[PDB]
Amino acid sequence: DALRTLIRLGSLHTPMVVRTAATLRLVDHILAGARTVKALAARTDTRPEALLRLIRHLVAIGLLEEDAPGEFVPTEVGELLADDHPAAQRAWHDLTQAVARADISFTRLPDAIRTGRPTYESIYGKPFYEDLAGRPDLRASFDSLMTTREDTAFAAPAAAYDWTNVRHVLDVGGAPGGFAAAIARRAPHVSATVLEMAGTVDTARSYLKDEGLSDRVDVVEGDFFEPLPRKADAIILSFVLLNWPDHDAVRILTRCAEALEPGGRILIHERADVEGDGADRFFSTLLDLRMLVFLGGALRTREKWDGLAASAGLVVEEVRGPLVSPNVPLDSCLLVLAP
Amino acid sequence: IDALRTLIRLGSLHTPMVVRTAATLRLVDHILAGARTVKALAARTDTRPEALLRLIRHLVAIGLLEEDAPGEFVPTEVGELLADDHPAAQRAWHDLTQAVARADISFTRLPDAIRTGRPTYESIYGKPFYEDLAGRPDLRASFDSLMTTREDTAFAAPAAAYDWTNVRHVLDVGGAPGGFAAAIARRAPHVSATVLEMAGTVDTARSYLKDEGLSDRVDVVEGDFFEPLPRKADAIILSFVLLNWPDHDAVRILTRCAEALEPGGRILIHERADVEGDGADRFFSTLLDLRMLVFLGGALRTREKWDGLAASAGLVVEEVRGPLVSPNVPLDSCLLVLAPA
Ligand SMILES: CC[C@@]1(O)C[C@H](O)c2c(cc3c(c2O)C(=O)c2c(O)cccc2C3=O)[C@H]1C(=O)OC
Ligand SMILES: CC[C@@]1(O)C[C@H](O)c2c(cc3c(c2O)C(=O)c2c(O)cccc2C3=O)[C@H]1C(=O)OC
């Protein structure tokens, strides 16, 4: 009972079985004809006796079901492992792609709790970003995973802010540019600038080009720690401050405050857990612990945000309620920061 | 969507690694010894306090810890199983510095085990499983410790599932510490027993039986069970031995046992024998089977697979004795009685 619950919680074979099914494109090969284990083994280049033992666990956890003897089809949850599903969960669990490869850092979590520093380098030889720049195949798969989420996740944050009295918007860490794209559709009178670093600056140009927004959202390069090149009535920090330590985040916040036009606002799009609420913490701590072992960053509660804001001459005006997006598991918040 | 959260939870590595880190840090033991605040726990575990609190946050979410009083954390009923003195020994079984949990890192390369059917332990640690233990005394001793705790209780029910009245001598191939032989001696004082075991791991046998007060009537012989067995016996026992080996090697050990079988004797296999369609619990069975694959290239075998191996060794499965329930042991076992065909 309690012995069963503890063993299930500390089991490594179940999450590795799921990641193996995704890496082998198992669900894809089933939908495309391969019904028997003999055909599934041939298409995945695996030994049939071993694949059946993996399927046996996949059946026991509800990702596959036996429909007629020997024929295995995916369940409704197992259908998410199809490569063309909108949630892209197969790519997120592919051990050859960036995120699931990086999740191996969790096998050294005791070191991360001892030091507070990431363990990615201790497994792959280089830190997270240096390894991406040296493996273009991995940098591409990471850029892809970010773009699949950015194409839909910003309609709700865009709707949670009034843009009538806004002239220009600067998105620091503009990423692919999905947020700036969502602001353009919501408020066509606003001009947007995506400010990115030397690396991601060109993944933003190509994304807004393919959206038909090249003439509507400018993309400039820059460094977040130097003075900002332009002023804006609204500066956006969407999932950027969680990558930097505390002493570097107040600098980015200070530069934003400095470049903030009169009456403007700084918008922080991230999590802001409150100790009292009964909100789901599963996805939040997943992201938080990922930040620890990947880069050393961290999430921040609403109380810590007040400390960061006050240190940048800013004040947290208001946290706009839970932002829900169709295929985005983690609900987010919008923080409004005034001087 | 509920399916999106169900799939992400099943495929998550942060939850099981948080449990193993808590076990490795002896977190629950330090709480029960006075340290309830984070600053006290960080001092006793030699960790960074801000990082420790983030690990505690996941532990309370998954119900292993609870925040009774502000800033003070206490283990739940499930969390109390990570205390080191707990009879199930789950803290040692999740300790990343000890043999079993260290070997579970082999799961990170499970796709290679499905492509080749051979273990992945060597690709993580440089040497195969047993060769790595024989070379790291700290690890072999921790491995011996995990088995010995289980061998102290898991053999009363299997011993009671067999009639020893007409048995004169019992040979236990792969006799482990010697728990099965110790359970038979207490149940049938008229039985002499010999424990057979390979190099290095015979050392754990003589001291366990001595500490059981049975050093008199349980012999211990060092040998290799791919060679002719040291003697004949009315009952030859294979308690969780064959699952460590592939099919061709298991048939050879089975063939050596059939060669040393006295007239009228029986070979007893103590392991699992699931029947496809039984509908019995398969959480503990799949874990052990997949562990055997990545650890050593072994496997569990179904009732039908057992019929094939027995026939290849000149044997027939006469009886399969029902689910054996042993205290603090999550996996019910079985006793297959084999006779010459
Ligand atoms: C380097 C790592 C990185 O920071 C990359 C990038 O910064 C990013 C991450 C996380 C999230 C979002 C990001 O853009 C994001 O936009 C978002 C959102 O709109 C709505 C809900 C959750 C999220 C969310 O959890 C981080 C990550 O772990 O990616 C695998
Ligand atoms: C590496 C160690 C080894 O492969 C071989 C080792 O001998 C052994 C194992 C497993 C079991 C028993 C063992 O003795 C055992 O006695 C037993 C029992 O009496 C009653 C129920 C279950 C079990 C059981 O699952 C394997 C293992 O991986 O440990 C979990």
Structural account:
2 copies of one chain form a homodimer. Chain A has 339 residues and is α/β, with parallel strands linked by helices. Chain A has 2 domains: 2-92, Orthogonal Bundle (Arc Repressor Mutant, subunit A); 148-273 and 297-338, Vaccinia Virus protein VP39 (Rossmann fold), CATH 3.40.50.150. Helices cover 44% and strands 17% of the residues of chain A. The first copy, chain A, contains 17 helices and 9 strands. Chain A is globular and about 70 Å long. At the A-B interface, helix 1, helix 2, helix 5, helix 8 and helix 16 of A face helix 1, helix 2, helix 5, helix 8 and helix 16 of B. The complex binds the ligand CC[C@@]1(O)C[C@H](O)c2c(cc3c(c2O)C(=O)c2c(O)cccc2C3=O)[C@H]1C(=O)OC (2 copies). One copy of the ligand CC[C@@]1(O)C[C@H](O)c2c(cc3c(c2O)C(=O)c2c(O)cccc2C3=O)[C@H]1C(=O)OC is lined by residues 147, 150, 154, 176, 239-240, 244, 288, 291, 326, 329, 331, 333 of chain B.
